[PDB]
Amino acid sequence: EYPTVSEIPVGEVRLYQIADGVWSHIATQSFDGAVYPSNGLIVRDGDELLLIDTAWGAKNTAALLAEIEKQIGLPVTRAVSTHFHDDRVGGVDVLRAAGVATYASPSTRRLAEVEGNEIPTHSLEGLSSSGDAVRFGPVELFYPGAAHSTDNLVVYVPSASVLYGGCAIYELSRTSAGNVADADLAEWPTSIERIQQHYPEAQFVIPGHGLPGGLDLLKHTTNVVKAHTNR
Numbered sequence: 001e002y003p004t005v006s007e008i009p010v011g012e013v014r015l016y017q018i019a020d021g022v023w024s025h026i027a028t029q030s031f032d033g034a035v036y037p038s039n040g041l042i043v044r045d046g047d048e049l050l051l052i053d054t055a056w057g058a059k060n061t062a063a064l065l066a067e068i069e070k071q072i073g074l075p076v077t078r079a080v081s082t083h084f085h086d087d088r089v090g091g092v093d094v095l096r097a098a099g100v101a102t103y104a105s106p107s108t109r110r111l112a113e114v115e116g117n118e119i120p121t122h123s124l125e126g127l128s129s130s131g132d133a134v135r136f137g138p139v140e141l142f143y144p145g146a147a148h149s150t151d152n153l154v155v156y157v158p159s160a161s162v163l164y165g166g167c168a169i170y171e172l173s174r175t176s177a178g179n180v181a182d183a184d185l186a187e188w189p190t191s192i193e194r195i196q197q198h199y200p201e202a203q204f205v206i207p208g209h210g211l212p213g214g215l216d217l218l219k220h221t222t223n224v225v226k227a228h229t230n231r
């Protein structure tokens, strides 16, 4: 049911409806000769849409906007990038040119600039301390602490019990850390525990890449991260 990496040619975007007014978007990208899927989120806010994360590149993100127009037909007015890597900010310029107000924490904006990635225009205040949460229209933004990156945010949709973990949460099929160049391995399990403690009611958990599941993805990610720590 959920679109898999094998079903999506690079350059195309699929949408998957999770609940009333909540979708994920799924794209694929080549990196080091392999193809990876990648998720973001779309949340309806009245007659507008809030977008969480780009579709990993300008071409994918243009296709994302086109696919949103075709399947939902409402304007994306704000977007949030959940950390500074290109699967989250790559395509911010496309969003901006389309009239989307792009947002990220000051930490994310800072790190994107240092890295040479695209920089969301607006700053999300109130998220710089581990455990901080702020409302952003139909979602809550939560900074759990450093994990996959020092700046990574998670997003909760209370009306639908959807927890979007981004790249701090691994899908079950991933049993090895992969690349963790910007991660804080020492803190990642503690940051995951903050997520568990703040959103214990979550029913639908969306990793940054791959298949959704339940809150068991949190323990699974901790298992993988600890195993990698002990390599």
Ligand SMILES: CC(=O)OCc1n[nH]nc1CNS(=O)(=O)c1ccccc1
Binding pocket: 031, 036, 087, 148, 167, 177, 178, 179, 180, 181, 182, 183, 208, 209
């Ligand atoms: C900096 C870093 O941690 O990169 C790894 C990562 N973790 N989440 N997203 C990414 C982006 N690379 S990836 O192609 O999706 C990948 C997926 C599985 C294993 C390795 C790489």
Ligand SMILES: [Cl-]
Binding pocket: 101
């Ligand atoms: Cl604005």
Ligand SMILES: [Cl-]
Binding pocket: 100, 101, 102, 121
């Ligand atoms: Cl703006």
Ligand SMILES: [O-]
Binding pocket: 085, 086, 087, 167
């Ligand atoms: O990433």
Ligand SMILES: [Zn+2]
Binding pocket: 083, 085, 148, 149, 167
């Ligand atoms: Zn990342």
Ligand SMILES: [Zn+2]
Binding pocket: 101, 121, 122
């Ligand atoms: Zn603006």
Ligand SMILES: [Zn+2]
Binding pocket: 085, 087, 167, 208, 209
């Ligand atoms: Zn990622």
